[PDB]
Ligand binder design. Structure first.
Ligand SMILES: CC(C)CCC[C@@H](C)[C@H]1CC[C@H]2[C@@H]3CC=C4C[C@@H](O)CC[C@]4(C)[C@H]3CC[C@]12C
Length: 134
């Protein structure tokens, strides 16, 4: 459940991310710095809401949401999206819709690490995070 994700995570490895970035139409200037930064993602629960903070040398982002309740999200690549995060078994599914398009993130816990899968059509990226000290 959500508890399993409530920790501080540090990005260690990214697979197929540049490809995915470019499928999204992410501009070059955001892309090249998105390939080298290793963000710190801090997930917690305030009341009944999940809070996701992201510390990065490019941008610091923060979002709050209740599971299943749609909300406006301005992504780090400046996409104004209608987003929904829900529980899917033991995984979190984050859906983003914008400009008639859609992309999805799947957060899971495999072997102690947080594995996040990003899908835009047939283009898929996988991002790996290790638990770090709070
Ligand atoms: C965080 C910056 C440097 C990345 C560039 C922003 C662009 C490419 C968009 C597209 C997909 C978005 C990402 C989706 C997944 C993650 C995992 C994590 O680490 C927090 C931010 C991050 C990385 C988002 C930040 C913004 C993002 C990366």
């Amino acid at each position: 459940m959500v508890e399993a994700f409530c920790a501080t995570w540090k990005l260690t490895n990214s697979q197929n991310f540049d490809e995915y970035m470019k499928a999204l139409g992410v501009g070059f200037a955001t892309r090249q710095v998105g390939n080298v930064t290793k963000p710190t993602v801090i997930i917690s629960q305030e009341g009944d809401k999940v809070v996701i903070r992201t510390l990065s040398t490019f941008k610091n982002t923060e979002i709050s949401f209740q599971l299943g309740e749609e909300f406006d999200e301005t992504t780090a690549d400046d996409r104004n999206c209608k987003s929904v995060v829900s529980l899917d078994g033991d995984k979190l599914v984050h859906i983003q819709k914008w400009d008639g398009k859609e992309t999805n993130f799947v957060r899971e816990i495999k072997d102690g690490k947080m594995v996040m899968t990003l899908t835009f059509g047939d283009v898929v990226a996988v991002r790996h995070y290790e638990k770090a000290a709070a």
